[PDB]
Assembly symmetry: C2
Homo-oligomer: 433 residues x 2
């Protein structure tokens, strides 16, 4: 007769968190009940309250929740609730038990292509929406669900993008029965790109105008209707995303890896991991944080240049957080060309994986840093995969059919045509074998 929510409702909160200006002096502070958006905001937890419990207490508390199907600890994010949204009521949490993603030992690729024996991939993309964003959306949508119930007018959530952010947002909104709206220029509508929000019941508007005319319409609409924008409560999603780092540690029985390579499409990622590794060390779960590499596609943004110039010319798509993080962990930034990224992807896939392009960027960077002697053959290294390879089948098909203009596709493995003659078949097989 009872659901898991009842089961746990059967059992003062010392923990809390608040918005704070990202990296400031004694500054100000906002509440999560508010919709502040700005200087970027950062979520700050009461470290004083948390330090009242030692490292062993936190390691054990979290480990005791591993493998459970209870509410809401069955989630890799909520199993660390005290460090994410300490004050939310379990009744408001919107979760699909995201997290607890596969931590894969890349034995063959590590050894055959990098002379490594301890290379791993954190498959954040192996989840229900096929994206790392689910970790952040469970937090954002839960908070929105909380505010909604406190009768703080919130008729729905809005979004103006067509990628993974939108897919994860609409999936969680649908889960809580919260209206989800997607605002897009008609010429940007692609059934393929919108398959998830669409399947998830989102209200997708094909507006006859351009991006600018669209942003203008959104601003006007949200100005008169209680509709929060996806990338508005951006700071909140990092609280969910940072648990992936805590998870890596937990999965290694609380041993800190030497290197963690994070593909930086969204530069908030690297900061989220840093935030997660950092909270673990500050609270004594572990004694150190790993050095991190921000792997970027060539010419994606000025981050790589600044890194090469020792950060000297850096002045606070917003690389502030990434710079801060990399500085704090003696980090590094490396690039990968379109062709390196794709060839690395084909090489990884040839060893049995089925990765996303970003992971190709991460592995290219790993290759380079290996040659440069920065990363040792025996360094325990973790590459973060943020999206399921299945989302990039067209790209793989193009590469393997040598259909990518201005690229050799040197590792393509197209089907081999052969006549239905025992002799002919035996000959091609003989060569292959």
């Amino acid at each position: 007769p009872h659901r898991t929510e009842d089961n746990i409702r059967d059992e003062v909160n010392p923990f809390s968190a608040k918005y704070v200006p990202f990296n400031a002096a004694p500054g100000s502070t906002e509440s999560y009940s508010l919709d502040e958006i700005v200087g970027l905001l950062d979520v700050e937890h009461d470290m004083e309250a948390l330090k009242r419990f030692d490292g062993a207490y936190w390691r054990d508390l979290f480990d005791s929740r591993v493998g459970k199907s209870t509410w809401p600890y069955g989630s890799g994010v909520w199993s660390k609730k005290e460090w994410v949204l300490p004050e939310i009521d379990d009744d408001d949490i919107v979760s699909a038990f995201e997290g607890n993603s596969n931590l894969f030992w890349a034995e063959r690729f590590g050894k055959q292509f990098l002379g490594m024996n301890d290379l791993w991939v954190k498959h954040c993309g192996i989840s229900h929406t096929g994206s790392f964003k689910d970790l952040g959306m469970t937090v954002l949508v839960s908070q929105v669900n909380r505010l909604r119930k406190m009768k703080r007018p919130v008729v729905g959530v809005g979004c103006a993008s067509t990628g993974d952010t939108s897919a994860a947002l609409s999936a969680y909104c649908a889960s809580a029965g919260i209206p989800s709206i997607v605002f897009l220029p008609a010429n940007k509508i692609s059934m393929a790109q919108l398959v998830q929000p669409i399947a998830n019941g989102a209200f997708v508007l094909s507006i006859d105008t351009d991006f600018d005319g669209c942003m203008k319409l959104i601003r006007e609409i949200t100005a008169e209707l209680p509709i929060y924008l996806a990338n508005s409560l951006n700071s909140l999603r990092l609280e969910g995303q940072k648990t992936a780092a805590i998870e890596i540690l937990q999965q290694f029985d609380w041993q800190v890896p030497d290197w963690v390579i994070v593909p930086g499409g969204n530069l908030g990622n690297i900061y989220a991991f840093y935030k997660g590794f950092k909270m673990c060390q500050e609270l004594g779960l572990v004694d150190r944080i790993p050095r991190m590499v921000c792997a970027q596609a060539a010419n994606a943004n000025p981050l790589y240049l600044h890194y090469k110039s020792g950060w000297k010319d850096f002045k606070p798509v917003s690389i502030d957080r990434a710079v801060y993080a990399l500085k704090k962990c003696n980090g590094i930034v490396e690039e990968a060309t379109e062709e390196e990224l794709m060839d690395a992807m084909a090489q990884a896939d040839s060893t049995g994986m089925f990765i996303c392009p970003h992971t190709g960027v991460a592995l290219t960077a790993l290759f380079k840093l290996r040659n440069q002697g920065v990363i040792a053959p025996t360094d325990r290294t973790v590459v973060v995969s943020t999206a399921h390879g299945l989302k990039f089948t067209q790209s793989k098909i193009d590469y393997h059919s040598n259909a990518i203009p201005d690229m050799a596709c040197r590792f393509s493995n197209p089907p081999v045509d052969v006549k239905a003659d025992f002799g002919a078949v035996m000959d091609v097989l003989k060569s292959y074998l």
Copy 2:
């Protein structure tokens, strides 16, 4: 009191640290018979006297009580050690007891997400304890990975014992082939796909291709193809994917053990298994059964085999009380369903799709088979067979991401001979505040009279 761990060591070397007599073993046995024949797993038998089944020495296993097994397995949860980091190998003693960890080929498959379908359960079925076992949320996006790690590990073992095995072959284009080639690539074992040229589809073969499989586009049909395969394998040491079929079930059954483990060893009332491949339902039965026989739990759940309408004679036989059943091979499914007081139900193409759209509307992103499973669940709910509070688990065998075209077609009302009654296409609107505000107002249902 032990030597410090070496930095050049991998988790595989790290566990080689072990030496007495292994009390556990398994062998091929004729499926469902009386006292008799047997063959080793190192052998390549396929039929007997016809299906083979893997039998474990229950005598040896029963020497350890239920609590010992529950605790041994639970102690491996959340670990990244070799090979226990795998949801399959964490139950090694019950899968391939004699294989050496050095021969195991694994990508730490298993430990898949067990999701509480709160909203769908309550809103569409009046249920409070409905769950989905996401076997499809894995590296190849398929449930087959649980079986291929076992099959490819065994093949890898036989290969190293110098028992000639130059590679593995396959004549299909679906998930089986994707999982097979991924694991083969992982062990550096040649993988070959034999297909008629007219059946080659880059989209259907993206994984074996990306995984380095040797894909042959043969100018002939299916029959000419099977003939060629029969000939090739007769002169070359190449095992066929669906040849060592029995072995795959050993891996697949761990999904059932995992469901129990995830519910803190509490047996669900119902488990609904979409039966495209009829071996699935038997694998789950095998898993639940072994847990009860060894005392981990004291009962098995009742099961439902959810089939697409007219997929095979299983549904009919079930309706005729199995009376007319005479031993693509439904023998295993029948046996299992009989053993657990099981049920068979159907779903039409449209019911399956509508159910899929309804499930997705609550936040999921399921495969068509899950639609079949939910349609069956709906029916059994109406019939009163399944109670509103029954702890029920629906098994999803493939990631919804593998069926985006299908969803796109349905939501764009482009599926011939179907209403697509729950399609949710994008809504066209003019760039006018008033216009936009009007559609949103309607959507948000902010009217008090037509609320």
